[PDB]
Specification:
alpha+beta; Alpha-Beta Plaits; 104 residues; signaling protein; trimeric; Nitrogen regulatory protein P-II (GlnB-1); two-stranded antiparallel sheet; homotrimer
Amino acid sequence: MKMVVAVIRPEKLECVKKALEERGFVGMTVTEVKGRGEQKGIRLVDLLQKTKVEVVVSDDAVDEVVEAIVSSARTGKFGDGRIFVIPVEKSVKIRTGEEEVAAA
Amino acid sequence: MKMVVAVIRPEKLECVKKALEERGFVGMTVTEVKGRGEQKGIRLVDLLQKTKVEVVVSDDAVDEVVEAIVSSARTGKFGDGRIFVIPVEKSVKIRTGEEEVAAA
Amino acid sequence: MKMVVAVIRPEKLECVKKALEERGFVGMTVTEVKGRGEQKGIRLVDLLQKTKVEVVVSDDAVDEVVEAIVSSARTGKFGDGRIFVIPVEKSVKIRTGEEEVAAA
């Protein structure tokens, strides 16, 4: 399992939700944050409001989650953000105590 | 070392704190977020307020942290949340600069 | 690539930003959280406001990021916080779709 963490423009959250829902990814966690990226060009940078979306998915769904977020979050301009993929070794359902365990 | 990340109902934070404290886990980080899970049944789902609790513990304490959060955060109803366990390779104490390093 | 996660005193955020900027680390994500550490001594502990800073850097930059945060965030007193280093397997630029992939 992997956690896919996207830091995106706040006005794009709804699009990203819809794009993920349509591929069958409804569980997520959303946090309000501030971020800045690294920019190229003559300088002459504040932390801006952004939205963090986290989904934990099977290994075989990562490409598809990342494609959905990229398609729906991108504008083509600096500040679109980044997606990070991080290993999750165990995912526990609190309601039942059942757990998923990462492949060896 | 592992980071144990629980996304739980906000009204359960105090119970989860107490349950962790009693097993000797006092250090944590708490973030206000919004989340939704995936539900089963006839549809005919907003992001709700939730609370994220993170603790970084030794490899040998993960089962015990996860048991404490499950016992104290569960209600038996949809929306209880999830716990994710993620590898931490290094944990640095800012006050002293000392670090813990994961097993090879 | 690694994600370096620092939970620091809020009044130290600007110092930590400057110290990271000067070493060439401008991209970051900042979240307002609450935390407490574990303390030594006669008891006789609330969650306090803290600031989470995340940067995702190349494997070869982790020591340098961690040194910069420790130098600029430390006061020598309990409550300075912790830095966690977590594996990132893929980092995707949303603007272009290009990705960085961790070493095998």
